[PDB]
Design a protein around this motif. Structure first.
Motif, PDB file in Angstrom:
ATOM      1  N   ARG A   1     -37.459  49.065  35.108  1.00  8.32           N
ATOM      2  CA  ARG A   1     -38.474  48.067  35.487  1.00  8.32           C
ATOM      3  C   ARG A   1     -39.460  48.522  36.557  1.00  8.32           C
ATOM      4  O   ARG A   1     -40.631  48.153  36.518  1.00  8.32           O
ATOM      5  CB  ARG A   1     -37.808  46.765  35.932  1.00  8.32           C
ATOM      6  CG  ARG A   1     -37.394  45.929  34.740  1.00  8.32           C
ATOM      7  CD  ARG A   1     -36.730  44.643  35.127  1.00  8.32           C
ATOM      8  NE  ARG A   1     -37.671  43.647  35.629  1.00  8.32           N
ATOM      9  CZ  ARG A   1     -38.515  42.939  34.873  1.00  8.32           C
ATOM     10  NH1 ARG A   1     -38.570  43.105  33.560  1.00  8.32           N
ATOM     11  NH2 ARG A   1     -39.334  42.057  35.438  1.00  8.32           N
TER      12      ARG A   1
ATOM     13  N   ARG B   1     -47.151  43.728  42.387  1.00  8.90           N
ATOM     14  CA  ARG B   1     -46.147  43.678  41.327  1.00  8.90           C
ATOM     15  C   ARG B   1     -45.003  44.662  41.508  1.00  8.90           C
ATOM     16  O   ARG B   1     -43.865  44.322  41.219  1.00  8.90           O
ATOM     17  CB  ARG B   1     -46.809  43.919  39.970  1.00  8.90           C
ATOM     18  CG  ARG B   1     -45.972  43.486  38.768  1.00  8.90           C
ATOM     19  CD  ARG B   1     -46.658  43.894  37.505  1.00  8.90           C
ATOM     20  NE  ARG B   1     -46.026  43.332  36.333  1.00  8.90           N
ATOM     21  CZ  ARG B   1     -46.379  43.622  35.083  1.00  8.90           C
ATOM     22  NH1 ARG B   1     -47.366  44.470  34.810  1.00  8.90           N
ATOM     23  NH2 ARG B   1     -45.738  43.055  34.091  1.00  8.90           N
TER      24      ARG B   1
ATOM     25  N   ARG C   1     -40.604  44.072  42.151  1.00 12.10           N
ATOM     26  CA  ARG C   1     -39.591  44.724  41.312  1.00 12.10           C
ATOM     27  C   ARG C   1     -38.656  45.606  42.122  1.00 12.10           C
ATOM     28  O   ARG C   1     -37.473  45.660  41.839  1.00 12.10           O
ATOM     29  CB  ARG C   1     -40.259  45.508  40.168  1.00 12.10           C
ATOM     30  CG  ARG C   1     -40.881  44.590  39.106  1.00 12.10           C
ATOM     31  CD  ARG C   1     -41.076  45.266  37.774  1.00 12.10           C
ATOM     32  NE  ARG C   1     -41.772  44.401  36.832  1.00 12.10           N
ATOM     33  CZ  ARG C   1     -41.962  44.669  35.545  1.00 12.10           C
ATOM     34  NH1 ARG C   1     -41.497  45.791  34.978  1.00 12.10           N
ATOM     35  NH2 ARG C   1     -42.617  43.789  34.805  1.00 12.10           N
TER      36      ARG C   1
HETATM   37 CL    CL Z   1     -43.438  41.324  36.775  1.00 11.04          CL
END
Ligand code: CL
Ligand code: CL
Lengths: 493, 501
Positions: free
Chosen positions: B437, B480, B484
């Motif tokens: 991710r 973003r 994560r």
């Molecule tokens: Cl995201």
């Protein structure tokens, strides 16, 4: 430069950056074509429009975040191997005293000119997005953004003159000073000025576009437990919609939410319009802009049949056989007395193009995998019942014409007519596969026809060549068809 | 010619017809390779061996049906555009009074010679079928046909002497005259004379091959409610297997399926397996959908192909077929292995195999609608015909890729798979999903970036590991990426920070 067979050939990736009043977004497509897949996606909620209605400037904290996002979008576009970049910006940038400076700086970051839309182009591109994403649409599209609400009439591949109302969610919440009552008074007054345009939408479809409204749709799907979490073609009747909006409006008993103000905007439109139903569009200004850059032939092509054929190209044992089937089922259906609508024919063709996409799956799960891949694909220009139809036809082809617990809910979404037509296609494809092995050259020598025999309704005719394919198995699957259709079938050479 | 991008390149399809005691089957493979997909698949039940034990001849009705199956299989092999055909028959095919004429008719129909295999060649090819479908197998392989039983010791890629017993399920049912007590006598006598070979399998694995034994496994899954109806790599402990075999034996006097079918071979296959398991006392029984015909093709591969890992070969093929970048899928397989130790994970060779496969498979559902990507990844991996992978290993891969697309949270979708894989494999799948991710936000699933990115210890006491980004990638910095990396920090319980050089 790559072993990648999972990528459509002939397409160079293209990035589209969309600078909006609330979100700044990057999407990378496989290519500038009718139905490309999304290779990368990113959204940052910058809020460039915060305070704009009150101050005459885009929000400076939003300007800072937007510029940072664009630096990163730039390097992502390169890493994603995009060969072309298109950048659009909100009309807000024109009404902002810091707009020109911002666009200049964004252009230096991206190395590329930015197309700053007018309210007229926003409305136009909203309409193109609905035109591109629905089959034969008819009603009025409404695109609610952060500052503005665009309304424009739609009919098939045409649209009317757009209007722009100052009833975006940011603008309305700021101007109303957070009062739901005042927000209602402002929406009512502005909608009232276009009572005539709106009145022309009664009994037709309201096409709801934009982030806040998409969020209203998502929330209703979740609360009502709707089984297919798929924005595109999500549809509610007027009264269910008005009912849910009342609940969104009174959700005090994040207090920074735009949802109630968005709910008020839509309610005031729907009260003046009285459409039969509300259909949600995942497609908007950005997709409508790209639609305008395609060629005429691509605009004219059917995005469902294009996406279905692409999947056959990517996954089937024979794309050529997938197209054979589509034509063959076309010729056969009328022999079984099926008088299909053009929507039905489209869906049958799609189903046939998609019939071999799960072939590598363990044999016990080929039907189930087909059903899920078909149901979860990002098709456009297909209704939810149409998805159910195409998923079902291909499940039934693998697992037989019996219904069970995994077919039930799709059967309930398809409705009886599409479920029946699905069984018929699944039934027909099973008889055919015994001759074809899913490869071309065989199916055009198979045909049903009428009988002179009073005690036979249809005769299935195979060449004497193909007699070694024949036997116990054909006769089983032919008897199943006769059962389903209620017709006395007969086999002949 | 064709537009088909969904066919692995440089493979001519290969057909194998096999003629057995109970059935005739056709399989078309994509090609002669280590892990090819099945293009086509058909089985007709013929009952060629019915009566053969007593009469020395096959039934006319079985011979008639088998020949019609072969005429059909002929035209299907051609329609599938196969470039080579192999036909294998059981030893009984020729030993039958009417066998030579049948073989001649069948060779005419097919336009191709039939390899009539001795009981010893079947034993050996059954071993190669097990060897080819398991990662480092270790035990005894048993293949139960209608006419005979084969037994052969397996140790990794090596294998022992292959033996044959006249203990086929159909044969045993006829020689016993349908008597289960008598069948137990015939089976105990034949297995007792190989007590030494079998006693060598104690505490190891029994690899169960063949039609009737496969049906015993399916019934057990069906009655037990087992959630993954996947034959290959299905495994039961001794005491559970012996319990179920006993219920199968006494099934005449739930369960109403086999109790009513009086012509069933399952009770006799259950007798033959019981007597092997009593003489052997393995820790567990693992079932194989692979047998003589797979082990036969495996023998025609190159030595390089045979030693290649079929799980990894198939995962790479799927990356070639489906991923945005197969080259990047492999970068991921490499990169993650070199990152795990930084997080203090010392992984076993098996755990490493699976992690690699998970990376090669991570991107196969990228075209799916974003709401359904994780679920689609999970289902494709669960429903795929992988070999050399256990059921908990299947769960690992599916979970890993579900978390990658869906975030590190658990839900009703992940509970069954998490249960199957267990707590160690579940937590390794979460770690991998969390790591994938973060790197996605640099790589955009494309090559050239991830190998420049590394985790290391921080001199700051308030940061345990820092993610080091060369100055070339400075503009990848964003809101973003921060979220994560913090999800990974919470998961791993280590304080993490980026260092944008
Ligand atoms: Cl995201
Ligand atoms: Cl992602």
């Amino acid at each position: 430069r790559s072993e990648a067979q999972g990528r459509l050939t002939g397409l160079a990736p293209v990035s589209v950056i969309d600078i909006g009043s609330n979100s700044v977004r990057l999407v990378v497509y496989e290519g500038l074509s009718r139905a490309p897949a999304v290779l990368f996606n990113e959204k940052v909620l910058c809020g460039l429009g915060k305070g704009l209605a009150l101050t005459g400037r885009m929000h400076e904290e939003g300007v800072t975040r937007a510029l940072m996002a664009l630096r990163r979008f730039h390097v992502l576009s390169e890493q994603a191997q995009a060969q072309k970049l298109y950048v659009l910006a909100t009309a807000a940038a024109r009404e902002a005293e810091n707009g020109p400076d911002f666009i200049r700086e964004a252009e230096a970051i991206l190395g590329c000119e930015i197309e700053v839309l007018s309210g007229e182009k926003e409305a136009l591109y909203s309409a193109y997005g609905v035109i591109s994403g629905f089959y034969q649409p008819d009603g009025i599209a409404g695109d609610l953004g952060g500052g503005s609400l665009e309304l424009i009439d739609i009919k098939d591949k045409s649209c009317g003159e757009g209007i722009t109302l100052p009833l975006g969610g940011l603008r309305l919440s700021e101007q109303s000073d957070g009062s739901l009552e005042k927000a209602a008074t402002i929406a009512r007054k502005h909608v009232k000025s276009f009572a005539k345009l709106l009145a022309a939408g009664e009994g037709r479809t309201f096409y709801a576009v934009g982030g806040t409204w998409r969020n209203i749709a998502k929330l209703h799907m979740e609360i009502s437990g709707y089984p297919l979490h798929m924005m595109q073609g999500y549809e509610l009747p007027l009264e269910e919609m008005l009912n849910f909006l009342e609940e969104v409006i009174v959700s005090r008993d994040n207090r920074r939410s735009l949802l109630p103000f968005g709910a008020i905007a839509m309610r005031e439109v729907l009260r003046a319009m009285k459409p039969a139903k509300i259909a949600f569009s995942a497609q908007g200004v950005r997709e409508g802009y790209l639609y305008s850059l395609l060629t005429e032939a691509e605009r004219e092509s059917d995005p469902l049949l294009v996406a279905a054929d692409e999947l056959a190209i990517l996954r089937a044992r024979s794309p050529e056989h997938a197209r054979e089937l589509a034509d063959w089922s076309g010729r056969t259906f009328p022999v079984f007395g099926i008088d299909e609508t053009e929507e039905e024919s489209r869906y049958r063709q799609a189903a046939c193009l998609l019939a071999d996409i799960s072939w590598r799956a363990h044999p016990d799960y080929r039907g189930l995998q087909a059903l899920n891949i078909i149901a979860h694909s990002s098709f456009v220009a297909i209704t939810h019942p149409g998805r159910a139809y195409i998923a079902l036809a291909n499940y039934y082809r693998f697992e037989g014409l019996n219904d069970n617990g995994t077919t039930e809910p799709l059967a309930a979404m398809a409705g009886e007519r599409l479920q029946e037509l699905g069984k018929l296609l699944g039934g027909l494809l099973r008889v055919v596969y015994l001759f074809s092995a899913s490869m071309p050259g065989v199916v055009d020598h198979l045909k049903f026809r009428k009988s002179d025999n009073p005690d036979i309704d249809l005769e299935f005719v195979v060449p004497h060549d193909y007699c070694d394919f024949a036997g116990e198995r054909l006769d089983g699957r032919l008897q199943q068809l006769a059962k389903l259709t209620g017709k006395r079938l007969a086999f002949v050479f």
